[PDB]
Amino acid sequence: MDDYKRILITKILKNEVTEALGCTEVGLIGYAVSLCNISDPFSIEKIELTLNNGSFKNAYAVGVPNTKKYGILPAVVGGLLGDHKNKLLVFNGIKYSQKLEDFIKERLKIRVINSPLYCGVKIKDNSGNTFESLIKDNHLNVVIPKINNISEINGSEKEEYKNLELLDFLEYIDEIPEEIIQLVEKTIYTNNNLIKGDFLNFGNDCLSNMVNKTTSACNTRMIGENMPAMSVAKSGNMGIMATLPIIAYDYSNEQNQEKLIKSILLSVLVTIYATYKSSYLSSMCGAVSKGGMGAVIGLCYYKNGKNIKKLDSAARTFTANLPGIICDGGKVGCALKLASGCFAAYSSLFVDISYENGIVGKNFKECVENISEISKIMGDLDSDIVKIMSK
Amino acid sequence: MDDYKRILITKILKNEVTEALGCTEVGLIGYAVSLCNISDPFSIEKIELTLNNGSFKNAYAVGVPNTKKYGILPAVVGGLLGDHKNKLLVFNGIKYSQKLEDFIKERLKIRVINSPLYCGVKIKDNSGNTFESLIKDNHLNVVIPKINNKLEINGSEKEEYKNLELLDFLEYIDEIPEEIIQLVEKTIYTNNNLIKGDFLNFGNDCLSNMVNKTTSACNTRMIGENMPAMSVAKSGNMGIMATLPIIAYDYSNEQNQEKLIKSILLSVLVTIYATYKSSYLSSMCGAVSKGGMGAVIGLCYYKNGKNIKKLDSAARTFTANLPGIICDGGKVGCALKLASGCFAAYSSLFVDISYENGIVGKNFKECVENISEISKIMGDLDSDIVKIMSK
Ligand code: SF4
Ligand code: SF4
Numbered sequence: 209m210d211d212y213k214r215i216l217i218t219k220i221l222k223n224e225v226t227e228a229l230g231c232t233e234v235g236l237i238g239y240a241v242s243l244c245n246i247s248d249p250f251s252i253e254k255i256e257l258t259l260n261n262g263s264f265k266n267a268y269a270v271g272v273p274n275t276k277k278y279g280i281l282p283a284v285v286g287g288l289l290g291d292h293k294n295k296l297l298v299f300n301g302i303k304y305s306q307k308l309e310d311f312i313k314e315r316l317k318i319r320v321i322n323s324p325l326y327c328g329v330k331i332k333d334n335s336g337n338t339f340e341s342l343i344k345d346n347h348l349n350v351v352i353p354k355i356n357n358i359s360e361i362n363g364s365e366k367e368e369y370k371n372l373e374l375l376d377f378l379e380y381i382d383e384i385p386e387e388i389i390q391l392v393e394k395t396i397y398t399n400n401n402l403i404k405g406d407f408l409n410f411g412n413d414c415l416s417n418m419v420n421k422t423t424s425a426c427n428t429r430m431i432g433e434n435m436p437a438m439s440v441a442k443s444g445n446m447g448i449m450a451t452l453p454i455i456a457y458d459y460s461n462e463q464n465q466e467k468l469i470k471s472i473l474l475s476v477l478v479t480i481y482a483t484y485k486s487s488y489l490s491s492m493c494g495a496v497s498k499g500g501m502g503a504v505i506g507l508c509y510y511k512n513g514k515n516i517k518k519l520d521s522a523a524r525t526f527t528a529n530l531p532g533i534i535c536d537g538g539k540v541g542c543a544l545k546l547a548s549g550c551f552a553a554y555s556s557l558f559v560d561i562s563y564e565n566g567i568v569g570k571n572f573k574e575c576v577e578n579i580s581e582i583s584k585i586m587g588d589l590d591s592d593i594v595k596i597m598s599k
Numbered sequence: 600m601d602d603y604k605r606i607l608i609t610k611i612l613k614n615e616v617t618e619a620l621g622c623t624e625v626g627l628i629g630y631a632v633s634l635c636n637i638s639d640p641f642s643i644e645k646i647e648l649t650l651n652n653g654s655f656k657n658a659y660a661v662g663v664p665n666t667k668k669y670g671i672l673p674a675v676v677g678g679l680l681g682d683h684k685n686k687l688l689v690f691n692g693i694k695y696s697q698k699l700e701d702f703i704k705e706r707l708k709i710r711v712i713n714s715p716l717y718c719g720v721k722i723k724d725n726s727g728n729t730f731e732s733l734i735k736d737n738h739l740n741v742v743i744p745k746i747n748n749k750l751e752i753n754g755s756e757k758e759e760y761k762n763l764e765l766l767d768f769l770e771y772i773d774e775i776p777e778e779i780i781q782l783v784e785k786t787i788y789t790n791n792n793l794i795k796g797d798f799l800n801f802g803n804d805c806l807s808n809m810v811n812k813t814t815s816a817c818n819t820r821m822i823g824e825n826m827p828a829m830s831v832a833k834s835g836n837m838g839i840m841a842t843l844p845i846i847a848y849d850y851s852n853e854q855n856q857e858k859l860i861k862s863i864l865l866s867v868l869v870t871i872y873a874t875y876k877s878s879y880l881s882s883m884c885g886a887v888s889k890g891g892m893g894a895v896i897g898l899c900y901y902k903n904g905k906n907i908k909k910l911d912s913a914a915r916t917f918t919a920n921l922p923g924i925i926c927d928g929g930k931v932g933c934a935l936k937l938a939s940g941c942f943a944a945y946s947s948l949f950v951d952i953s954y955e956n957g958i959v960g961k962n963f964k965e966c967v968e969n970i971s972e973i974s975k976i977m978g979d980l981d982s983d984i985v986k987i988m989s990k
Binding site: 268530548554555562596597 | 656659660669670798799801802804806810883916919920921922923924925927928930931932935936938939942943945946949950952953955956957958959969972973976977980983984987988
């Protein structure tokens with residue numbers, strides 16, 4: 209309808225919807241290690257990787273791409289075996305060497321700190337030369353190798369998007385640009401390609417299929433497969449949680465192409481909105497919360513159409529069900545949490561919760577605001593989580 | 600099994616498994632208001648009710664018995680229309696007056712504080728007379744007009760229970776005392792009687808029945824029905840979460856009486872164990888976590904018997920799945936959380952999660968310890984929750 213709204217929404221959709229190969233933390237580690245640019249990885253005497261609590265937590269037991277392994281050492285080995293030009297896709301075209309893994313295991317000294325995103329590599333060789341590199345802050349800004357390159361959008365556009373209402377999103381999915389239609393279809397393609405086998409199929413009903421497909425894709429992403437995931441705000445698990453429940457609901461129901469496209473577009477819009485509103489860092493599972501808000505809004509739009517009260521009731525029930533949940537790092541178990549998210553969405557399509565019930569917001573906007581504020585209230589827990597995992 | 604162990608377990612089961620009549624918070628409010636003993640409720644100029652964060656949270660939007668209403672204002676009206684001699688049962692035999700509700704709404708000024716259980720009523724009338732009442736610490740201890748009440752099992756027995764292992768519980772459910780069998784049967788009867796209709800039934804399969812029955816009983820308990828619930832550690836919703844999933848699994852499967860008895864007994868033992876180990880207060884949903892640990896251990900004992908690795912895998916998957924959910928007070932939405940708990944239990948019976956996946960413990964005891972530690976780390980946080988709910 210309005211022109212500026214369509215332009216802003218299109219630009220932000222083109223900005224936030226990317227292709228992420230596995231977890232951004234292991235990619236970060238490999239990219240920093242390749243930014244050190246070691247000429248001979250077998251001439252290394254000591255490697256000193258420094259991470260913050262969140263990075264160490266997320267990368268402790270997540271699958272490293274093209275290594276068939278888990279942990280931070282495979283990411284460091286892949287960075288040694290990678291090229292900086294691939295940036296976050298550092299693990300492309302590599303040939304994993306178990307010999308180099310055994311070589312670096314004796315020399316990789318990892319040290320954790322309490323701070324925002326921090327990734328500092330300091331490598332020494334046999335000759336004595338030292339090579340340092342550092343990536344800092346939430347935006348992936350390299351401060352030592354100085355290699356200009358992620359996914360930046362100025363604050364004015366973010367503030368203008370935060371001031372949009374759900375009716376703007378409902379009117380956008382009726383006037384979808386063709387480029388955005390292809391982007392949504394590419395999203396569906398990328399996230400559906402992540403379905404590899406059965407992980408949690410306990411029936412043939414709709415919720416069973418939703419849980420099964422979502423957990424299968426999450427397990428595929430967590431075991432270190434060389435397959436990208438269509439991520440919103442560089443969080444692939446959030447994109448999985450936002451898309452696959454709707455994909456499996458549509459697969460179990462009408463099998464409508466345009467309808468699934470519109471529902472997933474609305475889900476991505478809602479997920480981007482919830483990510484913007486949750487401005488502060490948090491140890492709460494942002495994937496489950498945000499991607500599930502997007503998924504439940506998309507499922508409610510699929511079930512009831514452009515019904516405002518239905519969407520508000522779905523948001524209220526989702527806020528009542530599963531708000532506040534730990535983010536104990538990238539793991540194979542993360543899939544389970546997303547499974548719960550599926551539940552949290554499905555059960556919200558059949559129950560209405562009054563606004564008085566606890567932290568439930570008055571409508572969708574207040575639900576998102578309350579979830580974001582609670583995420584802010586939970587505060588920094590990554591220090592205690594990393595202290596737990598060290599035992 | 601050892602004799603002292605059996606005696607301790609029997610004593611702790613008889614102590615912790617009680618019968619709780621509805622929600623205690625609205626009873627507290629009504630009793631404090633009725634202790635003022637207002638002769639004419641329509642001669643009131645202003646009421647000043649003071650609660651602490653926890654009390655305000657739990658009583659903000661919970662159903663008041665015999666009022667057909669929700670919130671703190673209905674509790675205040677029922678206390679004005681009740682007699683102090685009824686103590687926590689102030690709402691018995693009353694006839695709710697909407698006129699008095701509309702009168703008191705204009706004059707009830709509620710103020711929240713940071714302290715243990717605190718309920719102070721200060722009413723003024725047209726003549727100028729003032730009436731004060733105050734309840735502090737435990738529920739039954741009113742300090743104004745000075746009717747002291749001191750709050751069963753010494754700490755040594757709790758510590759001895761903390762040092763028990765899951766094998767002790769598995770051996771206890773084979774030599775059950777007859778009194779304990781009667782207690783389990785009364786528990787099953789009481790908690791199954793709370794099922795009034797369908798609240799979240801989206802099928803006739805096992806998980807559908809589990810979620811449906813659990814949510815139905817929780818909704819019955821939350822709307823203010825005059826029906827007692829068999830509570831573990833005075834938390835009726837925790838007892839529901841611990842018992843009803845197993846009841847509905849047995850209902851949908853083998854229909855075995857003794858097997859269900861043993862499974863629910865093990866669930867209650869596990870729930871008491873998790874409550875004892877989580878000694879510090881927390882705003883995390885203790886009902887879901889503890890009762891669901893009990894429920895998943897009971898379901899795994901029902902499915903696989905006295906298999907240690909099966910129980911360890913179920914506990915690990917439960918710990919990976921749904922830890923750290925908010926406890927935003929007693930509400931109709933609480934049922935949803937318990938529904939999620941059902942999910943978290945069922946999905947743990949078919950998946951194994953490695954201990955490396957985040958906060959997952961090496962076995963059952965380590966899982967409980969990590970969950971308790973995270974609960975302790977989350978702290979109080981009730982002040983921020985009530986600040987959110989105040990809008
Ligand atoms: S728990 Fe959620 S937010 Fe945390 S790593 Fe797993 S998917 Fe991401
Ligand atoms: S949110 Fe959880 S802990 Fe709080 S009252 Fe409801 S069931 Fe109990």
